[PDB]
Every structure is written in structure tokens, then in C-alpha cells.
Write a protein that holds these residues in place. Sequence first.
Motif, mmCIF file in Angstrom:
data_model
loop_
_atom_site.group_PDB
_atom_site.id
_atom_site.type_symbol
_atom_site.label_atom_id
_atom_site.label_comp_id
_atom_site.label_asym_id
_atom_site.label_seq_id
_atom_site.Cartn_x
_atom_site.Cartn_y
_atom_site.Cartn_z
ATOM 1 N N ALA A 121 -22.181 27.711 -35.557
ATOM 2 C CA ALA A 121 -22.588 27.021 -36.787
ATOM 3 C C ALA A 121 -24.039 27.460 -37.174
ATOM 4 O O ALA A 121 -24.940 27.398 -36.330
ATOM 5 C CB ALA A 121 -22.525 25.501 -36.579
ATOM 6 N N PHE A 143 -15.912 24.811 -37.639
ATOM 7 C CA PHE A 143 -17.390 24.535 -37.608
ATOM 8 C C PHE A 143 -18.254 25.182 -36.484
ATOM 9 O O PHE A 143 -19.236 25.880 -36.755
ATOM 10 C CB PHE A 143 -17.636 23.044 -37.584
ATOM 11 C CG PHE A 143 -19.091 22.664 -37.602
ATOM 12 C CD1 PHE A 143 -19.842 22.734 -38.787
ATOM 13 C CD2 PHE A 143 -19.711 22.197 -36.450
ATOM 14 C CE1 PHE A 143 -21.197 22.340 -38.777
ATOM 15 C CE2 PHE A 143 -21.044 21.842 -36.426
ATOM 16 C CZ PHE A 143 -21.791 21.878 -37.585
ATOM 17 N N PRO A 179 -22.197 20.896 -31.205
ATOM 18 C CA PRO A 179 -23.556 20.387 -31.040
ATOM 19 C C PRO A 179 -23.580 18.858 -30.920
ATOM 20 O O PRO A 179 -22.548 18.183 -31.118
ATOM 21 C CB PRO A 179 -24.219 20.759 -32.366
ATOM 22 C CG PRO A 179 -23.081 20.558 -33.358
ATOM 23 C CD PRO A 179 -21.942 21.254 -32.626
ATOM 24 N N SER A 205 -24.760 16.506 -32.877
ATOM 25 C CA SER A 205 -24.251 15.787 -34.035
ATOM 26 C C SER A 205 -22.698 15.601 -34.039
ATOM 27 O O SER A 205 -22.202 14.658 -34.644
ATOM 28 C CB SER A 205 -24.735 16.464 -35.301
ATOM 29 O OG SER A 205 -26.130 16.479 -35.328
ATOM 30 N N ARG A 263 -20.761 15.995 -30.844
ATOM 31 C CA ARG A 263 -20.516 15.359 -29.536
ATOM 32 C C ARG A 263 -20.764 13.860 -29.475
ATOM 33 O O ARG A 263 -20.143 13.205 -28.638
ATOM 34 C CB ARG A 263 -21.262 16.036 -28.376
ATOM 35 C CG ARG A 263 -20.900 17.470 -28.202
ATOM 36 C CD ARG A 263 -21.416 18.136 -26.943
ATOM 37 N NE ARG A 263 -22.819 17.955 -26.540
ATOM 38 C CZ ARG A 263 -23.849 18.770 -26.831
ATOM 39 N NH1 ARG A 263 -23.745 19.857 -27.635
ATOM 40 N NH2 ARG A 263 -25.030 18.461 -26.325
ATOM 41 N N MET A 264 -21.644 13.316 -30.329
ATOM 42 C CA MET A 264 -21.939 11.870 -30.335
ATOM 43 C C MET A 264 -20.933 11.057 -31.200
ATOM 44 O O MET A 264 -21.072 9.838 -31.338
ATOM 45 C CB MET A 264 -23.370 11.628 -30.858
ATOM 46 C CG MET A 264 -24.452 12.158 -29.954
ATOM 47 S SD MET A 264 -24.590 11.237 -28.403
ATOM 48 C CE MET A 264 -26.052 12.058 -27.694
ATOM 49 N N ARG A 265 -19.964 11.733 -31.834
ATOM 50 C CA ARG A 265 -19.070 11.027 -32.754
ATOM 51 C C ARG A 265 -17.867 10.370 -32.086
ATOM 52 O O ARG A 265 -17.427 10.761 -30.990
ATOM 53 C CB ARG A 265 -18.653 11.876 -33.974
ATOM 54 C CG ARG A 265 -19.791 12.553 -34.703
ATOM 55 C CD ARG A 265 -20.480 11.643 -35.706
ATOM 56 N NE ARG A 265 -21.317 10.587 -35.126
ATOM 57 C CZ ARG A 265 -22.586 10.727 -34.715
ATOM 58 N NH1 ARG A 265 -23.221 11.921 -34.729
ATOM 59 N NH2 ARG A 265 -23.236 9.653 -34.276
ATOM 60 N N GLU A 279 -14.695 8.797 -36.591
ATOM 61 C CA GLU A 279 -15.645 9.652 -37.325
ATOM 62 C C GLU A 279 -15.112 11.108 -37.390
ATOM 63 O O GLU A 279 -15.101 11.734 -38.468
ATOM 64 C CB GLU A 279 -17.025 9.565 -36.659
ATOM 65 C CG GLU A 279 -17.838 8.371 -37.105
ATOM 66 C CD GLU A 279 -19.137 8.136 -36.286
ATOM 67 O OE1 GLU A 279 -19.349 8.670 -35.162
ATOM 68 O OE2 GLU A 279 -19.948 7.352 -36.793
ATOM 69 N N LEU A 280 -14.638 11.636 -36.261
ATOM 70 C CA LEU A 280 -14.023 12.976 -36.260
ATOM 71 C C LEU A 280 -12.826 13.091 -37.239
ATOM 72 O O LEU A 280 -12.726 14.053 -38.018
ATOM 73 C CB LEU A 280 -13.633 13.404 -34.837
ATOM 74 C CG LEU A 280 -14.788 13.498 -33.839
ATOM 75 C CD1 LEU A 280 -14.287 13.690 -32.366
ATOM 76 C CD2 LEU A 280 -15.836 14.557 -34.277
ATOM 77 N N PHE A 286 -14.099 13.496 -40.571
ATOM 78 C CA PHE A 286 -14.591 14.890 -40.786
ATOM 79 C C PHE A 286 -13.435 15.910 -40.972
ATOM 80 O O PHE A 286 -13.506 16.798 -41.834
ATOM 81 C CB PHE A 286 -15.593 15.325 -39.691
ATOM 82 C CG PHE A 286 -15.959 16.792 -39.734
ATOM 83 C CD1 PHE A 286 -16.810 17.281 -40.724
ATOM 84 C CD2 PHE A 286 -15.451 17.694 -38.768
ATOM 85 C CE1 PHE A 286 -17.139 18.650 -40.772
ATOM 86 C CE2 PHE A 286 -15.782 19.057 -38.802
ATOM 87 C CZ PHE A 286 -16.644 19.535 -39.820
ATOM 88 N N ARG A 318 -11.793 15.361 -44.344
ATOM 89 C CA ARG A 318 -12.682 15.936 -45.366
ATOM 90 C C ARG A 318 -12.405 17.423 -45.583
ATOM 91 O O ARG A 318 -12.215 17.886 -46.721
ATOM 92 C CB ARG A 318 -14.173 15.712 -45.013
ATOM 93 C CG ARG A 318 -15.178 16.470 -45.974
ATOM 94 C CD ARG A 318 -16.563 16.721 -45.341
ATOM 95 N NE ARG A 318 -17.607 16.666 -46.374
ATOM 96 C CZ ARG A 318 -17.877 17.633 -47.240
ATOM 97 N NH1 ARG A 318 -17.219 18.785 -47.212
ATOM 98 N NH2 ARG A 318 -18.816 17.459 -48.158
ATOM 99 N N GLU A 319 -12.414 18.195 -44.506
ATOM 100 C CA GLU A 319 -12.180 19.648 -44.587
ATOM 101 C C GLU A 319 -10.783 20.053 -45.099
ATOM 102 O O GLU A 319 -10.652 21.084 -45.747
ATOM 103 C CB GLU A 319 -12.536 20.299 -43.266
ATOM 104 C CG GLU A 319 -14.028 20.033 -42.895
ATOM 105 C CD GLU A 319 -14.691 21.124 -41.998
ATOM 106 O OE1 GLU A 319 -14.150 21.527 -40.926
ATOM 107 O OE2 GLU A 319 -15.805 21.548 -42.360
ATOM 108 N N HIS A 321 -10.701 17.288 -49.044
ATOM 109 C CA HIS A 321 -11.806 17.459 -50.009
ATOM 110 C C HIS A 321 -12.228 18.939 -50.150
ATOM 111 O O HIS A 321 -12.353 19.452 -51.269
ATOM 112 C CB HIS A 321 -13.005 16.572 -49.580
ATOM 113 C CG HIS A 321 -14.295 16.903 -50.286
ATOM 114 N ND1 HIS A 321 -15.198 17.846 -49.811
ATOM 115 C CD2 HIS A 321 -14.817 16.437 -51.447
ATOM 116 C CE1 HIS A 321 -16.217 17.942 -50.649
ATOM 117 N NE2 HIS A 321 -16.011 17.100 -51.649
ATOM 118 N N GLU A 381 -17.489 22.102 -46.686
ATOM 119 C CA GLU A 381 -18.843 22.107 -47.260
ATOM 120 C C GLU A 381 -18.778 21.733 -48.722
ATOM 121 O O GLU A 381 -18.191 20.693 -49.057
ATOM 122 C CB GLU A 381 -19.584 23.435 -46.998
ATOM 123 C CG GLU A 381 -19.731 23.733 -45.542
ATOM 124 C CD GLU A 381 -20.047 25.201 -45.248
ATOM 125 O OE1 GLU A 381 -20.299 25.971 -46.178
ATOM 126 O OE2 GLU A 381 -20.045 25.597 -44.078
#
Lengths: 329, 329
Positions: free
Chosen positions: A31, A72, A103, A105, A107-109, A113-114, A117, A120-121, A124, A127
Amino acid sequence: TGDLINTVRGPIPVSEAGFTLTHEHICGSSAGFLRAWPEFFGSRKALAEKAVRGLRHARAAGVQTIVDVSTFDIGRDVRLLAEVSRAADVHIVAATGLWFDPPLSMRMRSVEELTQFFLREIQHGIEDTGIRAGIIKVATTGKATPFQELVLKAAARASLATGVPVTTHTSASQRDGEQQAAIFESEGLSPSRVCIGHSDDTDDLSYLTGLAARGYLVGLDRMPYSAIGLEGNASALALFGTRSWQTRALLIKALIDRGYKDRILVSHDWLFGFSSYVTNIMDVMDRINPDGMAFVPLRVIPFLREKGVPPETLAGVTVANPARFLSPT
Amino acid sequence: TGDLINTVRGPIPVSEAGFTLTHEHICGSSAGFLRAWPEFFGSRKALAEKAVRGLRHARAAGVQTIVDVSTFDIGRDVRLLAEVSRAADVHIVAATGLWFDPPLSMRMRSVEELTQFFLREIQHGIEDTGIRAGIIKVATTGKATPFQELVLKAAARASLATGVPVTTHTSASQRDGEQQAAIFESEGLSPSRVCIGHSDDTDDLSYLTGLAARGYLVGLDRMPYSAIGLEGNASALALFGTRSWQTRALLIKALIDRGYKDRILVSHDWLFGFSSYVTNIMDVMDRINPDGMAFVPLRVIPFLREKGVPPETLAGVTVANPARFLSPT
Ligand SMILES: [Co+2]
Ligand SMILES: [Co+2]
Ligand SMILES: [Co+2]
Ligand SMILES: [Co+2]
Ligand code: NA
Ligand code: NA
Ligand code: NA
Ligand code: NA
């Protein structure tokens, strides 16, 4: 007729995918890396040019579509994908998901939340581009880390909501697909939506038929990987192993001969740039396999034909199985 | 007059830096994350707006410049920096280097290759923007990993070639600065070019004076970090610890009283968005310190004045020391 798949250039009819390589990369990176340090690859222009020449060479060998399984964290650059797809006249399906280098950002999800994401990809756009993922890529290297279990459940849920298939990276020697399958099934995901990848990294046909029998797609996706003749090179040796392409290709036939022709996906796991391993691995690679993404139709398919696999069978593996797999279901 | 420093808006005279916070972030994230998933922060527009309001608040308290020590792997977005710098009328110095979350594409590199990447960001510009780094950020969390040793040597060499200072993240409790210093000195780097950061995370003044005595800058850069009153919250507790801001601030005075006023850099390690830790840590943070990057001049500087630190001394710490540090030497 009727079903569609998303590619980096917009929707295409499922039936126009044609001969499709299901596990490939334009560039295996990280990334942000191609934006921050393009000179690592000579330049971005040099990278695109090499990818376009490689892809036109695959096109000339009969390749119509590749699935770029860069997520990503493999540094997927959907604009670069679009650019080379367009220039080489080869369709490219982009991926969402996460590989085994996420990373902090990511790994903490949480699983919620994943899922959001990945959706979204797919729904939507990646990016700010509006380009939509047609596949969700996940990875283990052995027993799933706690975070990897979240990724696999979030992939299953994304897939269930969109009909987009899931494809995996395994350590094949460690039989990862068996846990991957248990996690996906615990989420209610149909095995027909899932490909267990790098499965040609093992000759354990008990492992592989066990998966096929349950309905999984088995990704024989590393066809040209061999360090034979380069055992001096320790990095090539750990990445490519000591089994020939013919040994890998024999697996395709072994699964067909065991009644599993409809469960097989074939590919190279090739790339045109490669920053996430040792420097100059790409030169080493290009000497092992100068045909790049044309190696399967030039070498593997005739090898199978000469061993007696019928052309209708071979068409089923390279056209019908990808179409059925990529078709949102 | 004469010396210049690079900021996200172009070169400024050293003398116009003024009151400068030397370890701050607009956003603590991951490479690519803000581009891939802006909604994590509400939106990119919401993020920029919150950063602009925060920075105008610091400006009103007397802050003229911050050093945003976000590297590549903290997801540094130099365009966002430029945008908020411009909107809030606060100078922002951008960083190169690597923190402790580098991806495979960075982790596989050699000291030569890293040096070339850091020099690119200092001499050519970050990405395709032409915006030049004014500082090199490095990190250990304990004993340096083998890769961390490469990063520190590559930072030393970048600094030696450009005159740009180096600043570090330590685990202060583990006394990391002592190895960091040994590695930098083995490369011939002057200690006046180096700040050992998060040094207010410990009260070991033997450790801290030992460093000051050798010529290092000691970064007392976590001033508002305290989990007192939130010991229920295990994530806040591990990040912020159980020492008050007054305890941290006492360190500034302790070093001044020991003859080290010229070796001190003060800061907050504040941010306006934060993706690389638990969800909603930013709400927790903003409740602990609603003054954000104004906390040092509103709270810390008057606290020191009231304990008898002369205003000329306090000006030396917040203006002269940063100017001397940032000035390419
Ligand atoms: Co893989
Ligand atoms: Co791959
Ligand atoms: Co830090
Ligand atoms: Co920091
Ligand atoms: Na790869
Ligand atoms: Na690979
Ligand atoms: Na941070
Ligand atoms: Na922090």
C-alpha cells in the motif's frame, strides 16, 4: 447472456471473460509504495510498458481476462490496472480483501469494520475511482492469526451480501484450506463461492480431493514456479520450491481423472513488478519464465492435451469454471 | 537570517518558524489508508476541517509551526498537510524515515536502498508533489530489530548528506535512546542532529542527562498523555500511562535545573485523526485534552513560569532549540 462481472474498465458480460487466468498480479507491492517510490521499478511508465507487453503476449496466446488478486496491502493500483487493461486489450478483474501484510490501521479493525471496507470496494468503488472489485482475496500462512479469522469472516459476509467470490492464499504444505473452509462454512458461505489458492504447492491429493468433494474450487495457480537449476539461490528456492511445472500441471489431470474437472481453476501467480520480496527477484523470475502470463496456454494446456485430456475438458477448466466462479451468485 | 527550512508550502526562513511543536501529527494512519477508506474518519473533508480548527486554536495560543513526524508508514498525506497548513496559517514541516509499521516492500530493503528513498523525499519531493521533507523520523520499541538497525544507519546517512535532523520514537522505559545513539554515532552522525523522542515517558533522569550530556536533543513530546481517571479503559491505559501532565512537565524543569536548557524539545504527539489504534481513541483523546495542540502554551508554559523558569529560558526551549534543530547543518 445476462450476468455481468466488474472489471477495471466497467461491467462486461460474463460470456466475454473467455479464457481467464484467476490468480495474477500486475504488480506485487505494498500500500502506497508505487506512489512513494516509483523508481524502485525503474519508473511507473516502465512498469506499465512491461505489463502491457506481457499482457499482449498473453492475449496473443489466447488469454482474454486476468483476475488481479492484489488487495490493498499488496499495493493494488487500480488506475495502473485500468491503464494496462485498456492498452493491452485484456480484461482485468480487481480484488478487495486483505493479504498477509496488513498495516495497523487494518489490523486493529473488527469483523464489522472489515465487512464495511470490503463492501465499499465492491459496491461503491476502490478509493475515489468508482472502479469496483469483482473478487475478495484473503490469506493465511499456517494456522490463521486472530486477525486472519476476522478477515475470513468479513470476506464471507461481504460475499454473502454481494455474490462476489472469495479466493485464498494458503501455505499448501500446512493444509490451510481445511481451516479456511471451516471458518467460511461457520459463516454460511457456499463452497462454490470459494477458491482455495496455491493448492498446486502440495501433491497431497487427499487434502485436495477432500476440498473438491465439499464443493470448493481448487486453485492450481502457481504453474511456472520452479527453482530447479537455481538451488544456489536461497530466496528463489524458498519462494518457487523444487517441483517442476510438469509436476504442478500433473495435478490438473489428477483432479480431472478423479471426477473433479468442474472444481479446478488454473493460473500463474505471475507479476510484472515485485517489490515485496528481494531486489531483482523480477529478473530471476523472467529468466525462469520468459513467457510470463502466456506460459499456461503455450506450455500447460498442450502438455495436458498430449497426456489425453479432451479439448472440451480443457475449455471447461479455462473458460466455464472462471465464468461460473466470477459470476455473482 | 539566511538559513531555510522546507515546509509543506515551500521554503521559509528559519527565523519565521517561531514557537514550534517538534513532534505532532495531523493524522496517525497507515500508508494508503486515508485514500482507501476516508469514511473511517467520517470523511476526508471532516478530517481536514477538524485539523484546521485544531491548528487555528494552537495558532491563537502562540503556535507558529509544527513538525508533522508522520512517515510513509504512518500514512503521511502531504497534500492534506499542505491544505490544512494553508487554511490554518500554521507552518508544517513534513517527515521522511520509517516508523515501526513498515510493509514488506520497505522491510525487504537494504541500507543503501533506504538511504536512496529518504534522500528522494528530502531532495526530490514526496511522491509526485515536489514537497520536501525537513526531518527524518525513525523508531524502535525496545532493542532494534535487524531492519530497524538498517533504518537508523540509512537515517544517519541521509542526514549526513542533507543536514536535515533525525528524530526518534523510543520505548523510554526500555532506555532505547542509548542503542539509537550508539548506532547513529557508529555512522559519524553528530548528536546535535538527533532528537531522542518520547523521553518524557520515563522519569529516569540518569538516562536522560546521560543523553543530554553527549549532545542529544531530548524530546519531551507527550505532555498531555495521561490515563488518570480512565484506568477502566485498558487501551487508554497502555497508551497514555498513569503519570500526570505535571509529572511530565516537571522533566523540562529538571533538565533546565541540571544545565540542559539547550537540549530540550517540547511537544504533544497530538493528532486530529487516528486509525492505527482502537476505534474512537480520538474521542477518548479529545476528552482528555480538549485544547489539542494548544495544551503546551496554555498549560505547560505557565506551569513552568509559575515554578520559576525565566521567560528567556522558556523562549529558548520553544523557539531557539527547534530553530537550531531544524536548520540544516
Ligand atoms: Co498468495
Ligand atoms: Co498472488
Ligand atoms: Co512515536
Ligand atoms: Co508520534
Ligand atoms: Na505476491
Ligand atoms: Na507471489
Ligand atoms: Na501515533
Ligand atoms: Na501516538
